């Protein structure tokens with residue numbers, strides 16, 4: 001209950017929110033049913049519209065009007081945004097030549113340049129080019145400021161997950177807003193687009209920018225706007241707040257537009273109807289920039305023009321129905337549309353079985369347009385699993401499609417032609433970023449980057465310390481003229497041992513066998529074991545181990561490794577393959593060869609008997625025997641210290657990557673450096689498991705089974721230089737392949753590996769940073785490059801989408 005008969009007199013769009021049941025005058029009052037009786041009359045004035053005309057110039061102030069054209073309006077801070085243009089012979093901001101803003105040019109009493117976030121819903125990245133003729137204000141921000149060709153949203157590419165990621169720097173799994181609709185089984189409560197539960201603070205985790213600002217003494221304007229407040233009034237309210245006295249004036253502001261998303265749903269991303277919504281958004285930008293210019297703030301404020309996600313062509317006829325796959329469709333609840341999430345309809349049903357639902361959904365139809373996953377098997381790049389609000393069963397829907405439970409859900413709900421929510425690497429889901437202002441660079445293009453990075457930068461722009469988040473602070477320093485954040489490399493926590501030869505062959509009883517059999521070249525083999533080829537194979541220094549553990553560096557002719565005495569296998573294995581390298585096979589006599597490593601005790605080694613006994617598990621090697629530099633060097637590849645546990649189904653993938661794809665990449669990239677290793681993430685939190693979290697071992701042993709295997713593949717960005725003699729910037733691609741006992745994920749897996757393996761690997765593309773979280777390792781410690789540049793490289797994601 002709100003006693004809605006106090007008054008908004010003088011309080012319109014007040015910044016502090018008053019406590020119930022005294023009535024409210026802030027932009028949230030509408031959605032709470034709590035506005036004072038006179039809120040519309042006083043606060044939502046519309047008389048005479050939003051623009052000055054020639055006859056209004058110098059008028060007598062009429063407090064009824066939406067905005068003013070009277071001589072007193074500038075000092076009141078409430079002129080129509082075109083006032084100086086119509087009445088004072090000034091130009092529109094968009095008609096001025098752009099001039100570098102080398103320093104903030106701010107009115108006296110401004111402690112820092114304000115930040116304005118101008119967010120546009122559903123603004124697909126290609127609109128910047130495709131709509132540029134009808135968006136002159138946006139085009140000027142873009143060409144004159146700092147822009148990316150696109151910005152990658154988070155998954156799912158829905159509104160609330162992405163806007164809250166913008167505000168927090170967090171993955172949806174960590175901030176808690178994991179979709180537009182959610183069931184939280186601890187609360188036993190549902191979050192919906194329509195309704196009131198969604199305002200409850202228990203849904204919203206992390207620390208959003210407005211809270212980070214307030215805690216640190218920086219005042220914030222509201223970020224939420226009630227849908228019924230017109231855009232012109234939102235802009236005028238921001239401009240009014242900017243005219244407050246110093247002690248009262250916010251430093252950070254947000255504008256939000258529901259367009260072009262709203263129309264894109266109805267007409268598709270490029271429907272002819274889409275031109276008008278784009279013109280209208282450009283006009284609003286024009287109003288803001290003209291307003292800033294009037295207030296002498298247009299070379300003082302940092303403006304961020306940013307979208308939450310793009311928009312794809314989707315219609316009703318492109319819907320798959322679970323009723324065509326499942327007998328038991330009435331015992332499930334589906335969250336439907338551009339992603340699927342499945343749970344039991346009733347928690348009393350103990351005949352509900354996720355295993356049988358997954359199987360009934362797997363490769364059942366020749367062109368099936370969704371793929372089911374247990375959430376922990378989703379590509380790790382999605383970071384979409386560690387939250388009780390994310391259902392165990394997930395469906396990744398192909399772009400352009402929907403999933404629904406039954407056909408009646410679709411026609412008792414064709415309306416629409418656009419939708420979004422798909423995999424965040426899909427081109428149609430990409431969105432926009434432009435930064436314009438004294439703190440951003442002038443006329444500068446930056447590579448595409450992820451929206452999880454922006455929180456840190458907005459904190460930098462406001463002199464705030466960011467709360468802990470998923471950005472990599474410093475990775476976007478190249479966007480900024482100043483206020484850079486100068487990170488330092490983390491300290492290594494564990495230093496390696498460098499074992500020499502310490503064990504005789506007969507001390508080992510591992511049940512392994514190998515068919516293995518000159519003074520000049522004897523010194524040669526010794527030098528290799530001490531590290532003589534290490535500068536060839538370890539190009540960027542050894543990775544640093546950032547947790548407490550016991551490990552050995554092991555050197556070889558063809559590869560170097562960091563061998564974990566605790567996990568009984570390398571944490572990492574590093575090797576370089578030049579353009580000229582040759583692929584050989586595993587000779588017949590060496591097919592089943594595993595060799596004890598006389599540097600590493602029996603007690604800290606794997607054994608072959610464990611693999612013999614484990615009928616499900618086989619093994620592979622991290623440095624591949626196929627790429628040995630010579631027949632004699634090939635023996636090193638069969639050391640028990642190079643062996644890792646692999647399901648036979650996974651070995652099909654691994655053997656093809658190692659025999660075919662590494663050489664292909666070296667040919668294409670002019671040499672590659674490869675770092676490969678295991679990952680253990682049994683609790684799917686995206687973070688390295690400790691030893692007491694491992695759920696599975698090679699039967700009868702303490703050999704832990706990896707959940708995933710990674711590789712980081714680096715070469716010279718200037719491919720005219722070989723990987724091992726690179727003078728400048730690096731180029732990287734990486735993957736984190738799920739270590740699965742079947743290839744059910746790949747529907748064409750009965751075919752030759754040349755038809756499906758590389759497709760699987762692309763799906764599981766990764767950032768080096770993702771691998772760092774999963775392993776507690778820190779790569780690229782010794783390069784010629786600046787640390788911020790290396791941070792950008794570590795956040796790079798190779799997407800395999802075309803242009």
Ligand SMILES: *[C@@H]1O[C@H](CO)[C@@H](O[C@@H]2O[C@H](CO)[C@@H](O[C@@H]3O[C@H](CO[C@H]4O[C@H](CO)[C@@H](O)[C@H](O[C@H]5O[C@H](CO)[C@@H](O)[C@H](O)[C@@H]5O[C@H]5O[C@H](CO)[C@@H](O)[C@H](O)[C@@H]5O)[C@@H]4O)[C@@H](O)[C@H](O[C@H]4O[C@H](CO)[C@@H](O)[C@H](O)[C@@H]4O[C@H]4O[C@H](CO)[C@@H](O)[C@H](O)[C@@H]4O)[C@@H]3O)[C@H](O)[C@H]2NC(C)=O)[C@H](O)[C@H]1NC(C)=O
Nearest residue numbers: 173174175176204205206386387388468469470685686773
């Ligand atoms: C992306 O960036 C984020 C942010 O940096 C990273 O997330 C952090 O990861 C840490 C490790 O997982 C985690 O640290 C834990 O903090 C616990 C205290 O947590 C509360 O306080 C913080 C601080 O204000 C708050 O942010 C938390 O908010 C979470 O939970 C609320 C309410 O549930 C949600 O509203 C919110 O959305 C958020 O949820 C997310 O995180 C939680 C985990 O905290 C998940 O469960 C959710 O699914 C969701 O993803 C909290 O309110 C603290 O309790 C932990 O301490 C345990 O472990 C340490 C190890 O050092 C040990 O010393 C202790 O023994 C202790 O164990 C005890 O509890 C165990 C479990 O019950 C039990 O088994 C033991 O026997 C013990 O009793 C731990 O230190 C940190 O909170 C989050 N922060 C956030 C915001 O998520 C994230 O990792 C990054 N992602 C990647 C891939 O890099």
Ligand SMILES: [Ca+2]
Nearest residue numbers: 121122159308
């Ligand atoms: Ca949206």
Ligand SMILES: [Ca+2]
Nearest residue numbers: 681687688689
């Ligand atoms: Ca983990």
Ligand code: NA
Nearest residue numbers: 611614615617
């Ligand atoms: Na076996």
Ligand code: NA
Nearest residue numbers: 743744746749
């Ligand atoms: Na298959």
Ligand SMILES: [Zn+2]
Nearest residue numbers: 122261265420
């Ligand atoms: Zn939408």
